[PDB]
Symmetry: D2
Subunit: 326 residues, 4 copies
């Protein structure tokens, strides 16, 4: 019934927009349609393997990884709606050549879950969008706002299906890519997380590194003091994959700070913030254990943050723990 | 270059076959092409949710689950190459009406990873093929052979891509579904597992239930006595998804017997055996901790078995443990 | 490189639009993507045959015919950019419910070449767009403008490929539907017809009915007085199919008035006008033999007109004839 | 329900075959799936234009033209079922390297309707299959049998849909390519032509060249002596396109010998014969005006023949004429 496109134009309808969210969100979707198409044949298309570079916070790039990044860069650029761009894959913020400038700052991870791709696990793209608040001719700093300054954010999941999750001030709506007519059709609106979940999602290979709170927490899920059944475990390795399952089934997802990394592994700008925004607009929470992610004022574009997101009841149970040990 | 179809005809070429493996494997592939197509649009196609029944060893069925089962049943039937069929989803072995009979017994899980489908995690189909050894007019018992009596087995993965993994006496070759021309094109031959892995794959939500061996083992991966780095964890929830990653990256996958279930959860006939066969033909191992899976003589079609499969070095490390506690 | 969508937004960029051409043209394209998808499987989709009705100027409807009509009606409606709609398939002009009204009047033949569909010949969709010029609350009459009052017009060809031909004041640009990513990509801009052609395109089954001018003309192509080689003949039966070939190869297309029908067979509003507009914006001509089609002021929405369009040199040769006999 | 593949295996079922028709017909279909995929995006895929060569009886080649030819050559080769191949596009018969030899001689036009492709008119592939009758180690001459020596023949139509028409001793069955699952599904069996048609299909641009019979005939369709309505005309320019329409709607198709070319334009081996075979197995006729096409014993592989095929009532009306003038 309702295409993605219709939905934004209608929303913008009564928000009395000028509509350059619309071009922008429309310029994104095609990329999403392009990334995904390639991914589904990434094997015959000889894309699995590596290009040859280390990402800014130290990851090994793959041909795909560049492909989608360029593409997204290009379509945002030509959308006429963005002035500053931040990407997984570039040292430095991209500024947009004035003829094409717009009021928008789009942070993004073009293809997250790098590990997963050879083993054909689900992969996704992540974005977050802010309004420039500045008189100042546009600069890198226009990206350094807290997550609470988002006007729109979500992600694409190239799983068993392709899906576009979008969060906007009004709430969360999922669309699913129809491969046949290549159009994003709306499958769930306006989504909400369970108050409490049955699943826990973390890499326990760092058991030796976790702090006492995470350690106590994880053990509470395996040995419930109430004697209820213990949460199931699930950890795919693709953040977008897990977030999503957390989102639809409820429960928790944790990429906590370990001993090794003061602030966790996941990038604040284009990974942690978007997912938190969604989570909060779905009615869940997103904490580091100490602060709301959404409130952190970034200083480095490429900066990391520990992240705990999920059904609030669960996210609180932990916070409570962290507080107990504070 | 080489279609799936070419590959089997060529293999059968020098094996001096009559060729009804070929029809049979060809009658499978289309189903695989049909299951997958549907899965990628399972949302617009209103397939997510439930039909209304409990599978034989107690699972909740979904519309999809039936769809693919019928389809596979139908295409095997019409292949002219099979006499007895065993399915996840039927109490009783299917016998084939004589005009359509063949020398083949095909066990199979039409769509495994039931949980995953709503959250768009990877899903797959699993099969194993035996030759009837019997004068006797065909019966259910023709399925009760050990796994070592397999002539062919593998699985389909509807992940970020669609992939057909096939194991035959000669070894393991992966094909990848080209969505465009709808043909299974060959991506890896003839595959082999690492002697040793870096990843561990189990549901630790049953920590309280595991036996001491699994318990000691899991802890060895988190706290290496050698002081090496601890294995990463990964558990998607779809056996085919994990097996595959284990297969391509190496490491271990465990669905061990717990306190609750004497023999684990995974069905011997159409889940455990195929994956073991592949694993062994890839050069890995597949144990219960006490016996080779391949050697177990089944008595109940629908029977379960604990299963530990993977890079041999890892699979042995555990066996050694289990032996220590024997 | 350039999507259809980009192209219109850019054009509208410097035309200083409000942009509701854009939604409108974007709301069209999806239909085009939807009509076409269905057509390519119209056989397995059991769409070939008939629904059960006679179109306003006396044609037999087919399930498809309705399908695409509804769809186009729906997407234009929801575009927010149109007040009055005229369709092959409705007695009466459609007015749009005010909340959804726009400044646009779109005439259209949802699926032309009805005959062709069972035999899998090329089929197409045709449209023309006018601006309402009226204070008056919108009515049927808003459609009765001459063709010269068009702001945009073109057609879709579901041939061996799918193609979107668009004519706008600035000229003619062809896009081709990429089945893979389902996006209209630009293949030719900004198109032009040969001054003179080598092909003639008419139904000679009405030889007995044609007027002396057409009769003399057709014979001149078969027996050139200059002793040059005689034009090749080509007549597919789908106007959009022939127009297009005329457009790319050059030459002439004729659906002249016969003895039987004072004014030919082809509908002025949503067949003759669009094709003339394109033809003129491609630099060709479009005559009845007596008047420019573009200048005819219509009185009946569903009214017909004889039409002769093509490379001008050829279109003139005829006019000259018609004049000689005037 | 029934895939193409099922259908041949079943037919071969009771014909007590060894089954290498089956591989062969299966090795064809994929090509058909490959040719077609490319054609639908021949524009974005930059395939429209020319490679640079003149075909054996004097046609200008295009990149596509080679592409599909190679492909078909390759898949037939690897089918293991063919010893001698004849193609539009090669001076000389192809012999097959013994390891891959089969009992089959396949004549074929890889992509017919060359003209049409830029204007996106329908295009097709044409084939005919004979059994080698020779002790003699295989040579070019194995192709020089009359059309009556065909075991199987038909064509592919990349029209608005993709369609596989197949004629076998038993009759005519049409399958239609499902783009989605990329499988040839059966749409009509076992087809038959009208005893009499309402349409005539010829290039009247050669009016000046036609013989008196064709001339009188064409005029009879425009001026019926019975005073019935005159046949409609239709001529697309792609033989496969017209044949097909003739096949489904009935009527006549003519590529008669003209003054200029003693024997017409269409190649006997891989154009005229297949279409005649189909026509006769559909219950229609296929004449030169003097002889059955099927009975002509060829001497040159690349040789042409005039061809008149269609509903028999119509095809006879003409013969009668030709006889009257004999
Ligand atoms: O394997 P690890 O250490 O758990 O990290 C994987 C994480 O990294 C990412 O691939 C991005 O770095 C996430 O999608 C995923 O959660
Ligand atoms: O959630 P659990 O208890 O780990 O079980 C999930 C397992 O069950 C299956 O869905 C089949 O039962 C496997 O694919 C998967 O490994
Ligand atoms: O078969 P006829 O009489 O030439 O009419 C066919 C014409 O009618 C249409 O199908 C629309 O009526 C045109 O596309 C086509 O040119
Ligand atoms: O344009 P002409 O001279 O009628 O020839 C076109 C004929 O040639 C072919 O393209 C093959 O030569 C046929 O498909 C078609 O009927
Ligand atoms: Zn990334
Ligand atoms: Zn990432
Ligand atoms: Zn199952
Ligand atoms: Zn299962
Ligand atoms: Zn119409
Ligand atoms: Zn029409
Ligand atoms: Zn050809
Ligand atoms: Zn040809």
């Amino acid at each position: 019934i309702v295409t993605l496109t219709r939905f934004v134009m209608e929303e913008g309808r009564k928000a009395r927009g000028t509509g350059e969210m619309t071009q922008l969100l429309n310029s994104l979707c095609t990329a999403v349609k392009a990334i995904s198409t390639a991914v589904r044949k990434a094997g015959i298309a000889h894309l699995y393997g590596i290009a040859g570079s280390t990402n800014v916070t130290g990851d090994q790039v793959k041909k795909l990884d560049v492909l989608s990044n360029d593409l997204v860069i290009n379509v945002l650029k030509s959308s006429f709606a963005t002035c500053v761009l931040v990407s997984e894959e570039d040292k430095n913020a991209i500024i947009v050549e004035p003829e094409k400038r717009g009021k928008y700052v789009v942070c993004f991870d073009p293809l997250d879950g790098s590990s997963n791709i050879d083993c054909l696990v689900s992969i996704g793209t992540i974005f977050g969008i802010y309004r420039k608040n500045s008189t100042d001719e546009p600069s890198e700093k226009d990206a350094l706002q807290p997550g609470r300054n988002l006007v729109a954010a979500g992600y694409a999941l190239y799983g068993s299906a392709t899906m576009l999750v979008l969060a906007m001030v009004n709430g969360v709506n999922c669309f699913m890519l129809d491969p046949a007519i290549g159009q994003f059709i709306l499958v769930d609106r306006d989504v909400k997380i369970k108050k409490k979940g049955s699943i826990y999602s973390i890499n326990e290979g760092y058991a030796k590194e976790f702090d006492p709170a995470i350690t106590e927490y994880i053990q509470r899920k395996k040995f419930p003091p109430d004697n209820s059944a213990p949460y199931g475990a699930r950890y795919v390795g693709s953040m977008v994959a897990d977030v999503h399952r957390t989102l639809v089934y409820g429960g928790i997802f944790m990429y906590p700070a370990n001993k090794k990394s003061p602030k966790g592994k996941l990038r604040l700008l284009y990974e942690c913030n978007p997912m938190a925004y969604v989570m909060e607009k779905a009615g869940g929470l997103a904490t580091t254990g100490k602060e709301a992610v959404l409130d952190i004022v970034p200083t480095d574009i490429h900066q990391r943050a520990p992240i705990i997101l999920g059904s609030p009841e669960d996210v609180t149970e932990l916070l409570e723990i962290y507080q107990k040990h504070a």
